[PDB]
Design a protein around this ligand. Structure first.
Ligand SMILES: Nc1nc2c(ncn2[C@@H]2O[C@H](COP(=O)(O)OP(=O)(O)OP(=O)(O)O)[C@@H](O)[C@H]2O)c(=O)[nH]1
Ligand SMILES: [Mg+2]
Ligand SMILES: [Zn+2]
Lengths: 71, 90, 81, 26, 265, 72, 750
RNA sequence: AGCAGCUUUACAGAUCAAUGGCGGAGGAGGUCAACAUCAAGAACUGUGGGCCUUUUAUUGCCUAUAGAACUUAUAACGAACAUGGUUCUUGCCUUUUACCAGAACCAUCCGGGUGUUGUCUCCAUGAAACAGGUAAAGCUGUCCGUUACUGUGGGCUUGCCAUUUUUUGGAAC
């Protein structure tokens, strides 16, 4: 498994496919690197005006995750 | 250099190879190991690429390729197009 | 096979990844997997266009890695024997 | 105790007068 | 196959032969498998007894090697300091332990369960002496444990092999070098061990004296010089004045009698 | 499976039964030991079975010591 | 005359790996593990280290043909002349090895081989202080004896990881002749005993926490190792873990199917017996009794190992060892167990706190190290040091603070240390020292030049600046587990040689951590040790190596202590401040003997001990199992320090025979005074004496616990022996399951 | 097991120039001999490089590399076990020899291992010719056979036994 235990209940920023960024609290994960996020937000640029709150539960498919950064 | 026609990757350990990747670059180095995925270990690896400024010279010649010295390098097999032998073992 | 064993043998050394997106991360290898998922710590990230950003940790999905440069002192680790 | 070698009691294996297997002056 | 050749220098036997020799040797073979049997009754403890001029029961006696504090009003008498303690811990229980050689401390308590007694008792059995011990997924159907081809766990010679495995040298070996008939010290094991029976005084004294000679031989080695040159018979054989032949031993002995008689007369 | 009586009989006569019928005697021991080692015994039974093992371990005749014994 | 040691660089054995690569592990903390091999006397620790050493080296000059064949053990780490002659380990020794796990990832492992004799429990304590993880080597026959319980408890207290090596399995097969099912029941019983002491941490063969071995026959294995070697190739890879976890417990197998009950009409044994014990038994049985041709084909077909023509000529024991070494290979499964079981993120901080003080992490740029002990190694004096932080380089100036001063400096710091040079650094090699230029965090190493600044242990530090100096932590004195109660008095045979003896005693005091050496007021020297063997070893070292002079010694004695059995009959004052005393309660004596704010303490005393409100507040000090109670506070508070000092002097030299006072509570009942301090201290000592003499004074003697292993028919003889020894008593008699032994537990006055 | 790969000591078929690979041009013994060597910084030689010694002959140390037979750790060729000499201290004594029995320092004797060469016996004897070289040779020229592709067989790998992290395409424009 992805050893993502370190990241549980912490904020992460995921760089996903298509030059998109999503920040959220890691709620759980999967053998495929699928992840669940609490409090998820889409990141567009530097200005917070272009950021968009997503929803209560967000599932990200594992092959779409390029990388994740701890926050 | 000419190599035996029956040669598989299992035979080419310690040979210097040019390994060509899907993004247009080449990696030259002594092969230390390979894997069922075609993951490769290149010792003393160097990367060469043809810059877009010099790419027009290849259209229907001296090409100034840019190099990085990498060192001991793992290539992930999905990125590899093909491999060519450059040199024999010492 | 050996390339994955070599990566798990690089654990605790400084390694440099290049990704399929073109980005380069140099940092200390914290953890690795048979997928080539890697964790890096104390990381310098080079954007493909040249921008440099520092991050405290990064986890990279192994499918997105293009190549990994490990220290040369690994060339005589027991795994090659 | 019965001798392992000859069954007769009164002596141990090492003291047995029978080959290993498997009146007196006044 | 069994011997290197007529030079008769090396031997190599099979398990059933070694088993048969071990079994035939029971009256003269060594039976003490437990090394703890020799506690305070071994070479080093005899060396210490000699150096300390202390004689443990059944041990050899020797001439003494050497010719306010601890006053009785200051000493707490709880247990007598036995002579056995003086050889067991020779530095702790002696004030002047000169020429003492520290002994082997101990060996794990032996638990070798004995067998070969009842013809059909197996090699593996829970002997009366032992305490009791009173406390979906699938694989290919042809998958089986290692060595499943052999149904017999215990082979016909296994008991013998285990018995020989625990026996003292040389029954512990399947190959070896030949030795001179005079170098096989058959009776030595008897006096190196405690007397097997409560024998008369003269017998116990003989046991002690044989041990004394053994201890002196161990204490004073006389190493041979590496200069193997000029051995007598080989030197004589090199001359034309000596010839060789083969004769019966009794004839050779009678010849030596006649020759010695002529020499002296 | 009335072990409480088998144990009582074995304490008294097992040592002769081992001389006379060592085959069946060592079957009864392999059955009795399998019970002790692999079955959920009640304590008063268990400690009497274990005490039969102590008896065999050190003095198998000690189950018929205290009875009156007329000489042969 | 003292040790078998390789003095010549040229003759140091070459490793199979490159040592420069192993030293390149050392700059990575997480690639170093410190492993302490501990366990009962003769459990096989040194033999296990022989296996690791022989795996790691190309050719060992000290290895005879008898050792190579397996007739005798190498005993590499038992290189002292005493250890060779006595046949047991006496001093802590070790080796730094590059070890690879089952995924071929190498780590540097610093192994420390500790003596198993209870007399040398001090060396075991040093091993526990130095190690991250401990391999508890248990002799499968005797099982979890009382010493195993103590080592497990001590490991938990020391915050080390554990793995258990169930050694000498050959004794189940060849010695006891247990059938394989009963050998399984014996192994399961042992593991259940182990688990009864490990709190809630479960130890199991399927978790690899249990390693099976026969160091005599050169083999060790775990279930994962055995499966990867011989079963993984016959089953789908995605099922290997599911198979491994089913190789223990009440699981039965028949035709590719598993069941928690035996299959009808099959009567097979559990999966562990079928897939692991039976083949092991067959290896033993066949190597000893099968014809070499058939055996050669079986080993080729099943284990894919090829017997050489020379091996076919080997004698039975050498051949059995050779075959087992071919099948089980190197110690890879043991290294794999070690390296997965230790997790520094959940142990290292707790360890460093336990050995020093809870607090902030030490800065990465400051050198901090624990000087565990000094060793007489390879004809020179060295210091065993574990680097906790920074980088230590040859020639660096360092501050060595003798750990006896740690408490003082800790108190002064929360609110000058000797300086010396690291003249040499070297890795442990058992019979050699491999020199290195520097040592990193996590390494255990030998350092020369610092051993003059301390006696038992010390803290090594090199602060960057006075800022970080505020954060410096000092290591506590090692808990040597056992207390030295066996006593002997000595003096030189010739008075002219007294200074030589003094120098030798200083060396002994440094090389034997648990020894207490004190010069008495009469001029005679007192040595306190753990037991008769401990004393015999140190006396041999004095007479043969350090003093080289003849020394007169007394018969064995013991350390007594003075106490009271009733309250003081009268508040008698003294002059030249009346003090009273009472017999301390058993519960508090026990807890203080185990070392277990003013308001918090008052809660402890009021709830568990029931002391009254004043007593629970007026306690001035706790010292050597005694308590001082102060019951106008300003009138008394002027001289609290001097009164305490007088009490400290009294409790270490009582009125009966100037023996330590123990188990008494002293209460200050009055003061005789309004330059004064000079009188207060001696008079308070005198007051304590009177306070005790006015009670019912008594003498206490230390009582040894005794563990006796004996064949069960001989229990009457042990009984008679205990009856013949005054004050000795038998408290328990455990049957050692599946063996003819009993473990008889009792007590004997020292 | 079948399928697949690697490998080639054998057999068959095909091929058969060269080149390459592989293999080769006595064996077992002897109550035979000679020579060498066998108790020490746990303690071994050689090749290569540096320094010192040496003064034309080689020694010692450090470094690099290759090999380290036999013997040895509860230390030792020998799982065994004698005698002599000198000195000291004893014993019985009546002086010496011959002796008592402890020590220390030294010898002799009965035996032993390993290596190398020779010899002796028995049994064998597609290429053992000729020439050079070496301490010698399985070294060089030379000679003989076999092999390269396919089939069968042997040995090894343990691959088979398209669904998110690699190899059944987010590519192409
Ligand atoms: N039968 C058997 N004996 C063993 C085994 N391992 C060690 N021994 C023996 O047990 C004795 C002690 O072995 P060591 O390796 O010195 O044991 P140890 O744990 O280091 O002993 P100490 O450190 O002194 O406590 C030796 O005689 C070994 O031969 C084993 O696996 N089986
Ligand atoms: Mg040990
Ligand atoms: Zn008989």
């Amino acid at each position: 498994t992805p050893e993502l235990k370190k990241y549980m209940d912490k904020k992460i920023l995921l760089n996903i496919n298509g030059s998109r960024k999503v920040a959220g609290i890691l709620r759980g994960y999967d053998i495929f690197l699928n992840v669940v996020l609490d409090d998820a937000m889409e990141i567009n640029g530097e200005d917070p005006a272009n950021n968009h709150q997503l929803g209560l539960q967000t599932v990200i498919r594992g092959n779409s995750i390029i990388s994740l950064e701890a926050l | 250099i000419q190599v035996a026609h029956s040669s598989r990757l299992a035979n080419l350990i310690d040979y210097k190879l040019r390994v060509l990747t899907q993004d247009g670059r080449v990696y030259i180095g002594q092969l230390m190991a390979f894997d069922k995925h075609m993951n490769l270990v290149l010792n003393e690896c160097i990367e060469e690429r043809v810059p877009k400024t010099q790419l027009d010279k290849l259209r229907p010649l001296n090409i100034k390729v840019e190099k990085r010295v990498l060192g001991l390098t793992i290539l992930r097999g999905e990125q590899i197009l093909s491999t060519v032998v450059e040199d024999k073992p010492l | 096979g050996i390339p994955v064993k070599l990566l798990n043998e690089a654990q605790g050394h400084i390694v440099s990844l290049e990704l399929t997106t073109g980005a380069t991360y140099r940092g200390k290898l914290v953890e690795s997997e048979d997928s080539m998922n890697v964790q890096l710590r104390d990381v310098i990230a080079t954007e493909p266009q040249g921008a440099v950003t520092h991050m405290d940790q990064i986890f990279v999905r192994g499918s997105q890695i293009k190549f990994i440069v490990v220290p040369d002192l690994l060339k005589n680790a027991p795994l090659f024997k | 105790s019965f001798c392992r070698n000859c069954g007769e009691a009164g002596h141990k294996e090492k003291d047995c007068m029978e080959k290993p297997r498997k009146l007196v002056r006044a | 196959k069994k011997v290197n050749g007529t030079s008769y220098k090396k031997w190599s036997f099979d398990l059933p032969e070694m088993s048969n020799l071990y079994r035939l040797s029971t009256p003269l073979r060594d039976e003490v498998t437990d090394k703890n049997y020799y506690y305070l009754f071994d070479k080093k403890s005899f060396f210490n007894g000699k150096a300390l001029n202390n004689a443990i029961p059944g041990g050899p006696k020797f001439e003494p090697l050497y010719p306010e504090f601890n006053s009785i009003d200051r000493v707490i008498f709880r247990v007598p300091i036995r002579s056995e303690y003086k050889v067991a811990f020779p530095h702790l229980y002696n004030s002047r332990p000169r020429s003492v050689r520290i002994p082997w401390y101990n060996n794990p308590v032996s638990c070798i369960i004995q067998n070969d007694e009842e013809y059909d008792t197996p090699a593996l059995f829970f002997d009366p002496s032992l305490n009791p011990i009173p406390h979906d997924f699938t694989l290919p159907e042809d998958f089986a444990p290692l060595l499943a081809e052999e149904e017999e766990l215990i082979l016909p010679n296994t008991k013998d092999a285990m018995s020989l495995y625990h026996s003292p040298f040389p029954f512990n070996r399947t190959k070896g070098k030949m030795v001179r008939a005079q170098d096989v010290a058959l009776a030595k094991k008897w006096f190196l061990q405690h007397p097997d029976e409560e024998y008369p005084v003269k017998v116990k004294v003989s046991y002690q004296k044989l041990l004394k000679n053994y201890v002196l031989n161990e204490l004073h080695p006389t190493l041979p010089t590496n200069h193997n040159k000029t051995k007598l018979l080989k030197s004589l054989k090199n001359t034309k004045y000596f010839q060789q032949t083969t004769i019966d031993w009794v004839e050779a002995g009678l010849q030596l009698c006649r020759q010695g008689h002529n020499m002296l007369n | 499976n009335s072990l409480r009586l088998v144990i009582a009989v074995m304490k008294i006569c097992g040592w002769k039964l081992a001389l006379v019928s060592k085959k069946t005697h060592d079957m009864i021991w392999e059955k009795l030991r399998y019970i002790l080692q692999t079955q959920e015994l009640s304590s008063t039974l268990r400690e009497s079975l274990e005490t039969l093992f102590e008896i065999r371990q050190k003095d198998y005749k000690s189950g018929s010591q205290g009875l009156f014994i007329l000489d042969p | 005359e003292h040790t078998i040691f390789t003095q010549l660089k040229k003759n140091i054995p070459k490793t199979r790996y490159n040592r420069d690569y192993m030293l390149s592990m050392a700059n990575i903390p997480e690639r170093i593990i410190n492993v302490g091999v501990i366990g009962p006397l003769h459990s096989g620790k040194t033999s296990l280290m022989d296996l690791l050493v022989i795996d790691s080296h190309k050719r060992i000059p000290d290895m005879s043909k008898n050792v190579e064949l397996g007739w005798k053990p190498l005993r590499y780490l038992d290189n002292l002349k005493q250890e060779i002659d006595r046949g047991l380990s006496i001093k802590l020794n070790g080796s730094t090895l590059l070890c690879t796990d089952l995924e071929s990832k190498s780590r540097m492992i610093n192994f420390l081989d500790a003596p198993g004799h209870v007399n040398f429990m001090d060396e075991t304590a040093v091993a526990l202080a130095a190690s991250d993880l401990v391999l508890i080597v248990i002799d499968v026959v005797e099982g979890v004896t009382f010493v195993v319980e103590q080592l497990i408890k001590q490991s938990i207290k020391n915050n080390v990881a554990m793995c258990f090596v169930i050694n000498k399995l050959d004794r189940l097969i060849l010695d006891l002749k247990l059938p394989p099912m009963d050998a399984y029941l014996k192994l399961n019983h042992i593991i259940a005993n182990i688990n009864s002491f490990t709190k809630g941490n479960v130890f199991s063969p399927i978790d690899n926490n249990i390693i099976f071995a026969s160091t005599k026959l050169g083999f060790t294995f775990t279930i994962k190792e055995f499966v990867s070697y011989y079963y993984a190739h016959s089953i789908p890879s995605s099922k290997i873990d599911d198979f491994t976890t089913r190789l223990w417990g009440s699981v039965y197998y028949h035709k590719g199917n598993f069941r928690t009950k035996p299959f009808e009409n099959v009567e097979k044994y559990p999966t562990f017996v079928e897939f692991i014990l039976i083949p092991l038994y067959k290896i033993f049985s066949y190597a000893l009794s099968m014809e070499k041709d058939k055996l050669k084909n079986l080993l080729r077909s099943n284990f894919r190992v090829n017997l050489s023509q020379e091996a076919l000529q080997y004698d039975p024991q050498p051949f059995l060892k050779h075959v087992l070494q071919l099948i089980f290979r190197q110690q890879t499964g043991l290294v794999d167990a070690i390296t997965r079981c230790y997790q520094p993120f959940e142990l290292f901080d707790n360890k460093t706190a336990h050995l020093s003080i809870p607090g902030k992490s030490t800065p990465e740029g400051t050198l901090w190290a624990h000087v565990l002990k000094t060793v007489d190694y390879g004809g020179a004096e060295w210091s065993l040091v574990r680097i906790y932080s920074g980088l230590l380089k040859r020639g660096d100036t360092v501050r060595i603070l003798d750990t006896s001063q740690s408490e003082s400096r800790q108190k002064r710091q929360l609110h000058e240390t000797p300086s010396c040079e690291v003249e040499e650094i070297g890795l442990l090699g058992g019979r050699y020292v491999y020199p290195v230029h520097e040592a990193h965090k996590g390494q255990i190493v030998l350092i020369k030049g610092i051993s003059s600044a301390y006696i038992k242990s010390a803290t090594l530090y090199s602060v960057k600046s006075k800022e970080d100096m505020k954060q410096l932590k000092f290591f506590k004195p090692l808990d040597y587990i056992t207390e030295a109660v066996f006593k002997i008095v000595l003096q030189p045979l010739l008075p002219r040689e007294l200074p030589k003896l003094l120098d030798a005693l200083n060396k002994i005091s440094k090389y034997y951590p648990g020894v207490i050496i004190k010069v008495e007021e009469s001029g005679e020297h007192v040595i306190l040790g753990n037991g008769e063997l401990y004393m015999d070893c140190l006396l041999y070292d004095l007479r043969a190596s350090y003093a080289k002079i003849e020394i007169k010694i007394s018969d064995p004695l013991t350390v007594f202590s003075e106490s009271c059995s009733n309250e003081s009959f009268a508040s008698i004052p003294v002059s030249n401040i009346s003090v009273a005393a009472e017999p301390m309660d058993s519960k508090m004596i026990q807890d203080l003997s185990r070392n277990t704010n003013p308001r918090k303490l008052s809660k402890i005393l009021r709830t568990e001990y029931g002391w009254d409100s004043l007593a629970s507040r007026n306690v001035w000090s706790f010292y050597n199992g005694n308590v001082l109670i102060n019951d106008s506070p300003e009138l008394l508070s002027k001289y609290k320090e001097q009164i305490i000092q007088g009490f400290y002097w009294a409790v270490k030299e009582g009125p009966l025979a100037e023996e330590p006072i123990y188990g008494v509570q002293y209460k200050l009942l009055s003061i005789s005074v309004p330059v004064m301090k000079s009188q207060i201290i001696p008079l308070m000592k005198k007051a304590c004496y009177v306070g005790l003499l006015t009670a019912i004074p008594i003498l206490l003697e230390p009582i040894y616990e005794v563990d006796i292993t004996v064949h069960a028919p001989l229990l009457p003889i042990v009984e008679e022996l205990m009856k013949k020894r005054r004050g000795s008593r038998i408290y328990k008699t455990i049957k050692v399951a599946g063996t003819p032994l009993l473990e008889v537990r009792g007590q004997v006055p020292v």
